[PDB]
Structures are given as C-alpha cells and as structure tokens.
Design an enzyme around this catalytic site. Sequence first.
Site, PDB file in Angstrom:
ATOM      1  N   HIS A 292      15.838  27.978  81.473  1.00 38.56           N
ATOM      2  CA  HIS A 292      15.727  27.029  80.482  1.00 38.56           C
ATOM      3  C   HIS A 292      14.677  26.110  80.491  1.00 38.56           C
ATOM      4  O   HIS A 292      14.386  24.932  80.884  1.00 38.56           O
ATOM      5  CB  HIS A 292      16.838  26.036  80.561  1.00 38.56           C
ATOM      6  CG  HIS A 292      18.186  26.555  80.343  1.00 38.56           C
ATOM      7  ND1 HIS A 292      18.755  26.613  79.023  1.00 38.56           N
ATOM      8  CD2 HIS A 292      19.133  27.207  81.448  1.00 38.56           C
ATOM      9  CE1 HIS A 292      19.868  27.413  79.281  1.00 38.56           C
ATOM     10  NE2 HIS A 292      20.108  27.825  80.438  1.00 38.56           N
TER      11      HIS A 292
ATOM     12  N   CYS B 186      17.632  32.103  77.290  1.00 37.63           N
ATOM     13  CA  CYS B 186      18.897  32.551  77.988  1.00 37.63           C
ATOM     14  C   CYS B 186      19.684  33.555  77.649  1.00 37.63           C
ATOM     15  O   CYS B 186      19.568  34.811  77.677  1.00 37.63           O
ATOM     16  CB  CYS B 186      19.573  31.202  78.451  1.00 37.63           C
ATOM     17  SG  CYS B 186      20.344  31.327  79.847  1.00 37.63           S
TER      18      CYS B 186
ATOM     19  N   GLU C  45      13.532  24.233  78.165  1.00 38.79           N
ATOM     20  CA  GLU C  45      13.611  22.887  77.786  1.00 38.79           C
ATOM     21  C   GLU C  45      14.420  22.168  78.848  1.00 38.79           C
ATOM     22  O   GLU C  45      14.375  20.881  78.707  1.00 38.79           O
ATOM     23  CB  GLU C  45      14.943  22.819  76.644  1.00 38.79           C
ATOM     24  CG  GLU C  45      16.248  23.161  76.933  1.00 38.79           C
ATOM     25  CD  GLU C  45      16.547  24.452  77.309  1.00 38.79           C
ATOM     26  OE1 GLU C  45      17.792  24.619  77.562  1.00 38.79           O
ATOM     27  OE2 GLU C  45      15.672  25.517  77.389  1.00 38.79           O
TER      28      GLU C  45
END
Lengths: 379, 1058
Positions: A352, A268, A354
Amino acid sequence: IKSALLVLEDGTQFHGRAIGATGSAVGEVVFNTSMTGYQEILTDPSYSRQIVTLTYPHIGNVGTNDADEESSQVHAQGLVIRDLPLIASNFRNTEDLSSYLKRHNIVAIADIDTRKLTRLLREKGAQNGCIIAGDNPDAALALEKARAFPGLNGMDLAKEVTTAEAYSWTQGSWTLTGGLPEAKKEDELPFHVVAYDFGAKRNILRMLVDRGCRLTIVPAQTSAEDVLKMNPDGIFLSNGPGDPAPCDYAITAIQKFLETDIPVFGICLGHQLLALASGAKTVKMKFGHHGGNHPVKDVEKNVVMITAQNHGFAVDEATLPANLRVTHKSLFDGTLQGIHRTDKPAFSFQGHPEASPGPHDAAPLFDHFIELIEQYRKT
Amino acid sequence: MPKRTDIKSILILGAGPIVIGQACEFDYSGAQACKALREEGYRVILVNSNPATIMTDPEMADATYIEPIHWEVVRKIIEKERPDAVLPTMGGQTALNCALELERQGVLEEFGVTMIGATADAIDKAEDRRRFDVAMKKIGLETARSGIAHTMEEALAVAADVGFPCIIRPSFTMGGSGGGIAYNREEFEEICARGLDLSPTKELLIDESLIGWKEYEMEVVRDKNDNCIIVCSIENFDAMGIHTGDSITVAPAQTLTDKEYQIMRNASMAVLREIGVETGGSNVQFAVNPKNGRLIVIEMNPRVSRSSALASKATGFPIAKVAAKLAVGYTLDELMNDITGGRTPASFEPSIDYVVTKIPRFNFEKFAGANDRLTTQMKSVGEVMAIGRTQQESLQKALRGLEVGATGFDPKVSLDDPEALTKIRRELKDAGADRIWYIADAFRAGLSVDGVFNLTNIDRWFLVQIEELVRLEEKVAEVGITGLNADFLRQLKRKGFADARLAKLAGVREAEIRKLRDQYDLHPVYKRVDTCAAEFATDTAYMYSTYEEECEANPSTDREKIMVLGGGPNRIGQGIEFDYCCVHASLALREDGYETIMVNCNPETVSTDYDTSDRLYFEPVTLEDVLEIVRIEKPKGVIVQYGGQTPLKLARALEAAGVPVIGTSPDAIDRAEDRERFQHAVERLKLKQPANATVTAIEMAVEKAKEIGYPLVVRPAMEIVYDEADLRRYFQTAVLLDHFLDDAVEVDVDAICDGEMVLIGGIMEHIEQAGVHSGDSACSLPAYTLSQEIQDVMRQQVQKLAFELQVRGLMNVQFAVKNNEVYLIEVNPRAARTVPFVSKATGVPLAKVAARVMAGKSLAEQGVTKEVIPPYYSVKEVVLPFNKFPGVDPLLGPEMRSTGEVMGVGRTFAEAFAKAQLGSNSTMKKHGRALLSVREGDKERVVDLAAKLLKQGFELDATHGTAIVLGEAGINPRLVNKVHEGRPHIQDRIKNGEYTYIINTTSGRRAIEDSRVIRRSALQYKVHYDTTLNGGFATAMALNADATEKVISVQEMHAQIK
Ligand SMILES: Nc1ncnc2c1ncn2[C@@H]1O[C@H](COP(=O)(O)OP(=O)(O)O)[C@@H](O)[C@H]1O
Ligand SMILES: Nc1ncnc2c1ncn2[C@@H]1O[C@H](COP(=O)(O)OP(=O)(O)O)[C@@H](O)[C@H]1O
Ligand SMILES: CC[N+](CC)(CC)CC
Ligand SMILES: NCCC[C@H](N)C(=O)O
Ligand SMILES: [Cl-]
Ligand SMILES: [Cl-]
Ligand SMILES: [Cl-]
Ligand SMILES: [Cl-]
Ligand SMILES: [Cl-]
Ligand SMILES: [Cl-]
Ligand SMILES: [K+]
Ligand SMILES: [K+]
Ligand SMILES: [K+]
Ligand SMILES: [K+]
Ligand SMILES: [K+]
Ligand SMILES: [K+]
Ligand SMILES: [K+]
Ligand SMILES: [K+]
Ligand SMILES: [Mn+2]
Ligand SMILES: [Mn+2]
Ligand SMILES: [Mn+2]
C-alpha cells in the site's frame, strides 16, 4: 462481567472479555503486526469478512477520530486484542475505542493470549473463526459458525463493498496543521483519473488528488466501454477484500484497457487483477501479509522500502507471462510485490503505497503513475 | 555492498572507565563490534582503559590495549599497529571526542587512518549545537527557541532573551554533562560557567523551556545504499525537563497516533540524512506538545547509546553488531536477522508484542549534601529493564527488579500522617528518585489523576494505570488472604503484582502467597523475544515471564544445566565487575559443555546479550522469579556467587526452597558475612582482628570504647570517631565498634579454593591506607612496598580461612598491615570487584576457573595450581562521581563512592601509576605550583614530599602549620591564607589558577567540615588533588615517568608471563 469468546475452526478457544457490540462475528482470522494505526485498519474495506487480531497488546491508546477513518465504515468483521486501555490519551481523540466499536456495532474481544493466537495462525495458516460476546457465550455454537464459514478462497468481496453509483472525488491529504482539507474544485485538478472501486481506501484517492488528479469513482462492475467513454487520463484499480480471482468482470474490462495506450495502475487487489488480466495466476497465502514493517525491494534499483501490507492472496511469480516483468519482491518471504507490463503503460504494487497506517516509504509508486499520465497526454 | 576490501585492520575506540552518564552500555556495544568485525575476518585493534570489560578480554580481539584513552597514547597505538580504519562510534562521548582530537591533531592523516561508521564532519555537525540547529532549520524541522554562547556575557544575553526557566546544553557533551535548568540568574551563572569549562568546544546552547512536553526517542540505522530503518521508538514516562537517562521510559511509543508517529519517523530519517550518518545507527530525540502534537527536534547522537542498548534488548535487534558490519560496507538487506534464525534480513522494522520498561537506578544516599532532584543533568548510576505483556505487568516487574527493596508500589508515607499530602505534593511537583512510589501514595491519599498530572506532567495514560493498581491493592488489603481466590489472584498476577507485595497487603508471609499459587496451579508462562511479534519463528531462547496461556520455554531434557544469577541494575559498588564474572562463568561452562542459563535484567550488560548464554531469562533477580525458572528448568546447579549482593542475599532462601546451589554454601557465606560467626572463626583460627564490641546504648559505647581505644570505626553508613567527645557527637546525629587501625596498609587478596588446594589469584596493595574504602583506592599488583615475608603471612592466612570457611570457588580477603602485623578486616566468600583486574594483570581467568571448580572440576584437574606473579606492574585507579554532585565534599573515606576504574601497565610502579592516573582523567601537570595543607600526623612525612616536589621543579605554597613544619626542616614555602585568615586565600588562589597540584590531608569531623572549601574548589577548577599522603607519594613518583612513552597489548603482556 461481560463475557466474550473466540473459537477457531480447529476447535481452539480463547476466552476473554467483550469490548464491543453484543452478538456474534464470523470471518477469516488474521493477525496484524502494526504497533500504531488500529483505527485506519479497522476501517479498511479489505478487512471485510475478516476477524482482526492485533499483535500489539495495547490497542486503543489514542482513541478514535474521523480523520483516521479509511472508509465510511468499519469493515473488520471483528476485533481481537490483548488489552483495552483504561483511557484514550491523545489530543486528536474524539471517542474511545469501546464506544466506537459499539457505535459501529462491532463484536470485539479483549484479554486473550493474542500471541498464542498469532503463533497458531503462522504455524498452521489462516483459519476461520467466530467470536461470541454475550451473557453466556456458547462454545459449541461458536465452533459451529466458524466451521460453517464458506471461506475467503473464491469469494468475490469486491462486488459487495463497491459503490452503488459513480461519483467524483477531489479531496487531498490531511495535515497536522490543516487537518483534512476542503475538496478541490475540478478546474484545479490537471488530470482526470478513473478509479475502479473494489473497496477503496480514502487515502489512495486523497494521495492521487495530491498529485493533481480529479477522480471518478466507479463501481467494480463498470464496463471498460462505459469507462473509455469518459476520456480518462489514467485508470486506477483500487484495493479490496476477497479473492481477486472470481472477479471476472474486472478482469475482462482490464483486458480491454490493456489494448489501449491508457496508463493503468493497480494497488493490492488491483495488482492481482492486473496480473490476472495479463495471464498470470494468483494463489492464497498461508497466513498472508498484514503489518507495516514489511521490507520490499525494488529489484531494479536494489533499494528497500518498509511497507504497509494487507493481503491474503498473491500473484505466482512462476506463472508470469513474458510481458510481465517483476519490479518488487518481499524481503520477508520473497513473494511477488510489483510488476510492470513490458509492452504497456501498466504497472502495479502489492503493498500500500498510500500506507494509512504505515511508513510512507512506498509513496513514490504514485509518482510513476503520474509520469505515465503526463506522457500519455503529451501523445 | 559487501565488505570493504581496502580495509584489513580496524581500531575501535573504547569508552574508558564507567561514569554516570557513560556506563556499561559501551562495553556491550564495544564487545558487539569486536565480535562483529572479528567474525567478518578483520584485524581488530581496540583501546580501553577499563579492565573490567569483556571487550578487553584478550580472546576478543587481535590487539587489546588497556592504556589511558589520550590522543597522544592512542597515537602511539596507531603508530605501532598501523590500523587502516578507526571506528569511533562505539565508545560514547570519550570515543567521539578522541576521534576528533586525533583528527584535529592530524594524527589520522599522519598514519593514513580512515574514519568509518561516521565521519568527522558528521560527528561535529551533530555534536556542535549551533551546527545542529542550523541543520534542522535547513530541513524544516522545528527546534526550541535558543541561542549560542561562548562566554558568560553572551550566555546572559541569550537568557535575557529566552527567559527563565531556561535549558543549558553544552556542545560536545552527553548525559547532560555540564548542563541543567536555570530557574534564576544565580543558578544560571553556576551552570553556564560549569558547562563552558566542561564543553570540549567551549560552547553552550541555551533554550527556552519545553518542560512538561512529552519526550520521545527513536533508534535509527542507515546503510550506504540509503536504506533506513526505525529499530525502536521510546516514549518517556518522565516528561521533558528530566534527562532521558534519569527517566522511566518504555517501548514502544504509546500515545502517538499513526499519523504522528509517521511524521516523527520521517523526521528521524531526515535528520540522519542531513547530519550525514550514512553507515550506522543514531538516536534522534524529540519533544511533543501533548496539546497539539507540535513536534520539536531536540538532538541527535551520532553513535550507539544507552538507548540503543536498551532498544537492542527490547527488540532483539543487535544494533551495534549491525552497525559495525555496515561500517565496513555491508548493507542491511545483506545482513541476516540474528534471532529469527537468520531466516529474515536485517533490513526491516521490528514489531513487538509486549511492553518494555526501563527504570533508572540512583545512589543519592551515598551523597548526603547533594541535590537529589532530577534534572537535565544525569545523576543515575545504572538502570533496570523489564518485559511484560502489559504495561502494568512490565512496570511492576521492573519495580521489583530495581534492587532497592521495593516489591512494587510500597508506601512511602503514612495514611494517617497529617502532613502526608504536603510531602507527596512536593515529591510530585519536584521529582526526586522516589517519585514513582509517591505517585501511588498520592492516589492512596485522595489525589485524582488530574491533580497528579498537573503536578508531574506524566501522561494520564500511565497515571490511570498506576491508580488502578492502587485500587486493586486496597481490595487486597480489605479481603485479606481469604479473599485471595484463584480468579482474583490470577487477576493480580496478570497485573504483575509480586508475591511479596500481596503478602504484605494480606498480612502474610511471601511464601504463603507462593504456596497459594502452587495450590491453584498459578504459574507464569514464558514468551520469547523475536523482533517480529511472532510473525516468524525463532531458535533463540530469550525469554520473559507473563501470566498467559501458552508457554514457549520448552526446556531441554537433554543436558546438565547451570544457572547463573546476575546482579540486576548496576549501582555504586555493584558494578560491571560482577557482570564480567557472570559472563565468564557462562562462557566457560558453556564451552565446557553445560547448558548455560542466565538470569538478569540489566539492559546495559553483556550478560543480557542473547549471545552470551544458551538460555536467557530477562527477569528480575528475585526469589519469586528465580524459583519459577528453576521450577521448570530443573537445573543441575545454580551459581549465586557472581552477581554481587543481589543473588547473595537470596542464597539461603533459595536453598531452603530446594534450589541446587553450587559452590560455597549459603551457610558458608553467612559465616563470613555475620560479624558474629566471623569473629568466632578468626578466634577459632587464632588470627588477628581489631578489638571490637557491640554497643546498644550511648553510655555503653563510651565505656566499651574506652576498652577498645580510639580511634573508632562505628559500623551500623560508616564513620570514624576519634575521642570520647567525638563519640557522643556522632551519637547525636547517629552497632559495631572497631578499633580503627591508623597508619596501616590495606590489602586485597583474591583466591580460589576447591576443597583440596587454595590458588592465590592475586595480592594487591592499596595506595590509600586502611580507612579509605578498598573500592575507592588505587592498588598495585604486585605489592609495591609490602615485604615478601608479610605477604607470605597473608597468603597463609588466606589458605587457613579458605579451608575453614569451606570455600568452593572464589574468595576475597582483606587485611590491614600495621607495625609489621597482619590484621583481618573481612572475608568475602564470593567473586569480588577486583577479580577482573587480577585476571587482566595475571592472565588467569579467575572467573572461569572458579566456575569450573564450582561446577565440579578441580584446580589440579584444570592445571591452574600455581600463583602467577607477572613481570610488570599493574595499577588500578578509580573514577569518582563528585563532579556530578558539586554540593558534596569530594573526600575519601570508609564508604565506597567510585563508579569505575582503570588499569595502568608499567615496567615500574611509577610507570604503571602514571598510566593509571592519566587513565583516570587526572589533570596532573609536571610543573607549576603545588599547595600543601596537611594534618598533624602527616606533618612529618610531608617534608619529604615537599622536597620531592621541589626536586621536580614545582614551587610550593602552604598553610600556617604546614609552613611551620616545612620551615623547621629548611623548606620555606610561600605562605597562603586560609579563608578566615584574610587574603589572598587558597580559594582565591585556586580559583585564579595558581595551582597545578594540591595535597590536602585532614583528620577530625570538624577539621574536615572546615577544609571542605579546599577540596570543593580544587574540583571545580580542575586541579589535581590528593587527599592522602600516601596518594601524594604515588603522584610524586609518577612524575618520573611518561605514560605516553610506551604501550603494550594485553596479548603481549600475557605472552611475557612465565
Ligand atoms: N527546551 C527544553 N526544555 C526542557 N527540557 C529540555 C529542553 N531541551 C532539552 N530538555 C531536556 O534536557 C535533556 C538533555 O538534553 P540533550 O539534548 O538530550 O542533551 P544530552 O546530549 O546531554 O543528552 C532532554 O532529554 C530533556 O529532558
Ligand atoms: N578496623 C579497621 N581499621 C581500619 N580500616 C578499616 C577497618 N575496618 C574497615 N576499614 C576500612 O573500611 C573499608 C570497608 O570495610 P568493610 O568491612 O570491608 O566493608 P564492605 O563490606 O563494604 O567492604 C575497608 O576497605 C577499610 O579501608
Ligand atoms: C564521558 C567521560 N569523559 C567525557 C568524554 C569525562 C569523564 C571522558 C574524559
Ligand atoms: N584513588 C582515589 C582517588 C584519589 C583522589 N585523588 C584523592 O586523593 O582523593
Ligand atoms: Cl486466551
Ligand atoms: Cl560527555
Ligand atoms: Cl505550541
Ligand atoms: Cl512507612
Ligand atoms: Cl474477587
Ligand atoms: Cl549537588
Ligand atoms: K483470558
Ligand atoms: K586507510
Ligand atoms: K548531540
Ligand atoms: K529555534
Ligand atoms: K524525560
Ligand atoms: K545498569
Ligand atoms: K584502602
Ligand atoms: K564486603
Ligand atoms: Mn546527546
Ligand atoms: Mn540526550
Ligand atoms: Mn570490604
């Protein structure tokens, strides 16, 4: 009756009810399409100085819990929702949303036409606003504060949320069965990664650990030199709030790492930084990408993944340097999603990997990072 | 990646007649696929025995086969059309089952037909319970402790092991067909025997109980490139233990944390991957323990479902259209998203800014002796769907749109009833169709949310919501109309309270609340469905009402608009036939240039497909909701004649309120429906009607009845009384009195009137005599026994009636023919359920023509002025739900109980009937032993029937009196003992498989209740039985034909017409 009011830069007013702290909040207003994950979102540093609007009407159905916190605090400037449920109903809940908001001292409003709000932002682009919750919310005043807001364009927020002093992270991911695990012992982690904290989500760190990394969190402004000194197996550039542009320190440093052979991965904001440090250009999106149903194509493999997005700025594909190949693009708007250095072991992803909240689709992006690391050690 | 090329022609397996558990959702999906493939330039071939489907409209495909969905017949279709591929995932279980038989039978191999969308192995893997369980374990997913059975002995041991209560689930069934919950060994053997028999693979899966856990469903789509998406998630309101189809459900999921949702999402994908679904959609079901998030995989359906339709309506994501395209090589990223103007790809996960609620529709009042408790086997006959910004708003709208007379949470018990708490408790503990209302009653009665939770296991998240609504109603009751200030009223509206509900609480008229709202300027706003939570714009106008700020309706100033009102959820008698008409009115007028607005909330139908109209209002079909739409659309006309009873009952009020109703006037309608007004008109016209009376008291009837003469047709439920003693008897258990026309031929006549001329759509002779509901009768077009002279007489009376009543569009007339005399049963001044069948049979789209007429274009003008009499016979047969309600006596009568119908096309009546019969899933054999047991008045014609059976090679068995009669005629059947007679008895004989055919005709309440065992057993054992002598003769005739001999397409049928 506990009033609350939200006013946008254009003068558009939304009258509703206060569900958080008494007070005022000023920030850029954004909309998020995530049907689940409100807590993780609230606790996302990237949301600093931003007033969060959720499109899903019922926000708070599952309550809150410590495990669902992406950071040590609530970064969202404010919260705008359609309906606050009467109760929270989930075995994992430890505190209701309203209580939680209050405790974190967040100004929040409910019962407003979030849809109207969303269509406005999409149509006319992001806007700054102000929420006032109290006995007699002053509209004029609210307009005043909104209008007076400096704006996120050119705003370096990374230095604002970064950690004061360096630290070590060795904690892995949560499991339904085991919850959040006990921090691992250094000798247990194979690699050692150095992570720049530009307002890092705990899940990024945790998932890195899951891959066998022992971390060293460093302040945003840490010097490449100071870093190199640590003998990192890899360098990681975290996510974060504000304009990536003004963060000279980081850019400069990254440039320094790029002269080396050490693997670099940015997520990001760290993706934007990488790009900038490679000679690319970043722009501020109309309204940006905030949600968790975003299709992103891995142009290389020609496969799609549903991802978790949260960004107001992007990297201009048209200005990319030749050493910067494109790895992923959005299926929604065609915007730049991933890049890899043609000549260096450095790559990044706009979304993202994650998640948290969100589809796990993009997790393998981490995997590549490991490869780079393992191969860097081989040498 | 792009479309497949080694494929040109595709056969699509349709679903067949509508039955409980396998309804309208398949015509929607079947139609979407036709549409999708056709659009992609493929040659489409489909088979569907159900004539009331849009999918079988000749213009939707290249080769339409309305033939019985039997592998041998389908074989003849494949042999004749030579399709390259077959898509078997768009016609529910019928299609899966058929695709696999075709496979088993080597037919696919034989003609080189490729299975697309899903493979035979994939199908079995999911369909075979054992195999599925094995796959879950392989992928580390957890399943309930269970075991496989193939025999009762085996099943008993699984039980011994899991204990009671336990869940029984047959392999190769859905809608819980053949399953249930066994609380004891007795219950246990019954269910198991039933499912073993029903199971196509004779195999059960017996599980330990998870009753009360949360129930969830996920709709997934996967492409060949391995792209995978979650189109929609569903959280069930009713917990595990009550089948998803009989449950109230909502979208999206509400009480899962993101962490739990991801695990479930990942599992879902994993399941598709493992089972092998590579090119389509699938539904994955789970159970969640609310206590610890423990996830259990329940099942997966390798095709489109009732849930997928609901999910497509809920999100705006056309699942089936997408899947059909993927079936031919397309990939998600290649397809565009329909509603977002094609601006975005189909490769995404929808996000919605509202709450979707589905409530099932039941019909227990139609099955007296049935078990009315909700279980794992579906019993619902349909469903409604509602959209709201909130759950409260969403639920109440659905309540009011269910068509059961509710205005929302209307009370079921009295406040001041001493036993109320006891009744409520029971209703809560053991869920029936009315539970939702009883929940509200519970809160009114002083039970807490926890107390209600404990009994129902419904998540507190929902319960508190309902409690708050009650609390709000109590204030309304207290403050009355005076308390209805703007602020409060608006609050109420936002929670979805209906004007009617508020009026009842306030002790006022519904129109008073509506007036009040006009005063305050309190009107709803319309939001649109867009699949992405407003993140992208949409050019589609798929809307729902809500009390918010911003309105997105943006009505045109431009065109002349025509509004079409739908029928809401389907129920027995108000089925897909009415929706088919609605759809055609829209397609015709839209094509004619009007701006077509559809108002409906049935998630299963094509009517509620954004494609069908210009504008779609997914709303409850009520006066309040409709007026609001009218208010802003200002249409040119509204059609209320096509959605069944629903819109019909609204007509007067609509008009009163100033709506521009088109076609036959509400008054005109009333004339026909009011038995009084009617009797005068018949009188007026000098037509024949059975003698009738209107009795108040018992002793008044007995007299009047003497007047009228037995037998008698008591119409408040309907019964047929035979003698004075019978009258009282009724009266006890128990008004219009009507002389029952014994031994008469019932006839249906569909027609169109434009005020200038009357067009005879079709004359249909039923097989079953008058007395057996027209809706449960088989019928022939053209007539098979009626003389031309008499039909001509009926055609004339239709004409006279049409003009007199002032018909404008469709009408239907029912007659009875007795002793060469025409009698009038009733006139239905609107579109009837027979309309689609007649259109199919004759090639004329009656619904479209009548729609134009209503709209203003004459029959002459359209060039449809001559009655069409096709060159072949068309026979309609029905499907009854008795096998879903074993306690019920599977016998025909004056009240309609069937769910669907089929159509048989033949060169002769015999051939047509044969096809229809087989199409209806009849177990009829052309050999064996028949059992004859007929009533007095039948004892005379039976003889010929007996001979006929004899000529075929059947052996005969018969009961006492029947045997006497046959004996005198020279036919000596083998005597059989009635149950009370000794042994062996019929029951025994039936159960032992002695019979391949049964003919049992009964007359008289007592004689009926007596003979109940024969019918019950016949059904249980799957023996073909006829309950009418007339039906017996038809069956007899059909033995002389071969339904698999020849197949014809609708296109070919229509081409033979002159
Ligand atoms: N172990 C169980 N305990 C309780 N209820 C169960 C259990 N397994 C399934 N059910 C219930 O039975 C229903 C039907 O089972 P399912 O596998 O979906 O069969 P079908 O294919 O007929 O839809 C479920 O929707 C659920 O409410
Ligand atoms: N007088 C009668 N004599 C014989 N059969 C009748 C008579 N009246 C009605 N029936 C039977 O009852 C059925 C239902 O009656 P009907 O008036 O048409 O009610 P509905 O509105 O449900 O269609 C008819 O289809 C027919 O078989
Ligand atoms: C679901 C409908 N059937 C099972 C597939 C039985 C009525 C078709 C024969
Ligand atoms: N058309 C009604 C179904 C007929 C059934 N076989 C019976 O005779 O009752
Ligand atoms: Cl608002
Ligand atoms: Cl089935
Ligand atoms: Cl458990
Ligand atoms: Cl009552
Ligand atoms: Cl008030
Ligand atoms: Cl039953
Ligand atoms: K408001
Ligand atoms: K082929
Ligand atoms: K299954
Ligand atoms: K198991
Ligand atoms: K359920
Ligand atoms: K329905
Ligand atoms: K009949
Ligand atoms: K009627
Ligand atoms: Mn199933
Ligand atoms: Mn199921
Ligand atoms: Mn009728």
